[PDB]
């Protein structure tokens, strides 16, 4: 579960 960056 690659998680999108929080600034994405």
């Amino acid at each position, epitope marked *: 579960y*690659d*998680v*999108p*960056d*929080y*600034a*994405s």
Partner: antibody
Amino acid sequence: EVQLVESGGDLVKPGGSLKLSCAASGFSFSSYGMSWVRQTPDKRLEWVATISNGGGYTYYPDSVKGRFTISRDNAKNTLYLQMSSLKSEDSAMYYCARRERYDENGFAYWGQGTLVTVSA
Amino acid sequence: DIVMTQSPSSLTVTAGEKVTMSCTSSQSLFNSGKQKNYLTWYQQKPGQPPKVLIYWASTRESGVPDRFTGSGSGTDFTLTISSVQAEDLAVYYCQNDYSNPLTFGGGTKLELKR
């Protein structure tokens, strides 16, 4: 101690390429995402590329797209920026800071840069 | 790019004196989702990689000495040392951490009165 340790920033002619590595400890690299950040000679620092914790999600500014690529290596447990087609204005110190996943609070952990100098 | 403006490029300061510094954004950094303006303040010394003092405008890092108060919300923002020390004379930056591209603010350098 988390430890990010950079290498690769040489003096290459513009139009050339440079690869940079950044080493990680004190955490499971796989859980957090890495970024590369440059500090220019007049000392403004600017975000070069951001990845995620395994890959896929690759992020860059428009200054960088085309030339640079951020990579990962979870067993060698190392972060790389492939920089290519070097303009002189790329000359900067390159830091691999990291992305604070759980908390959201910046770049609290920076390695101690690898100076990229591109000159003819 | 969400553009961060830091002012002033410098600020003189005696010691044991309250100093405030600023940053501003074109857009705003505040999301409703989490309920936070994502403007992180950094501090830097020659030789030294910058470090996180405040994150989310207002919230101080672990270790950051309590003189360091956060504020600013939306588009204009503030960095406030209630009582400056030798050990605080350094360049301070600000950053849109809200949304890519992550932009930082130009610089405000502390240099002390003589």
